[PDB]
Amino acid sequence: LPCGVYDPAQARIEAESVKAVQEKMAGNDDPHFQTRATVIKEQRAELAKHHVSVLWSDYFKPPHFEKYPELHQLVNDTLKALSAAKGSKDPATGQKALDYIAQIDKIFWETKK
């Protein structure tokens, strides 16, 4: 629009679902459950990626990229971490994507200050 309402919480919540699904995949080896878990994980990781991408294209502005010169690469690393989580059943991959999003969330809130 823009309307100006952004919050990395959207990206965070979806990535939390990714990790939560990967964790459930460890405790239920039923093939149908594993398949559904895979299906859901794939959707949620892609929605998390979309939320991170929207922050980067629609919310962050040149003065933010000036002030935080590592921002472009951080967002790109976050997206690849989400791709790695969606390709894995290991909750450590989910967690890494969450740790990256946390770094974006800090930067975001600093820029609202």
Residue 111 beta carbon to Ni ion: minimum distance, rounded to whole angstroms: 16
Q: Does 57 bind a second copy (CB under 8 A)?
A: yes
Report residue 68: phi and psi, to 5°: -115, 90
- What is the CB neighbour count within 10 angstroms for residue 4? 7
Those residues whose C-beta lies under 8 Å from the C-beta of residue 26, and which sit 6 or more positions away, are 89, 91
Residue 7, binding choice from a second copy, Ni ion, none, Cβ under 5 to 8 Å by partner class: a second copy
Q: If you search the block for the tokens 């990206």, which residue do you land on? A: 11
d(CA 52, CA 59): 10
Q: Does 50 bind a second copy (CB under 8 A)?
A: yes
Binding mask 70-99 for a second copy (x = CB under 8 A): --xx--x--xx--x--xxxx----------
The amino acid sitting at 8 is P
Residues that bind a second copy (CB under 8 A): 1-5, 7, 9-10, 13, 16-17, 20-21, 24, 31-40, 42-44, 46, 49-50, 53, 56-58, 60, 65, 72-73, 76, 79-80, 83, 86-89
Annotated binding site for Ni(2+): 3
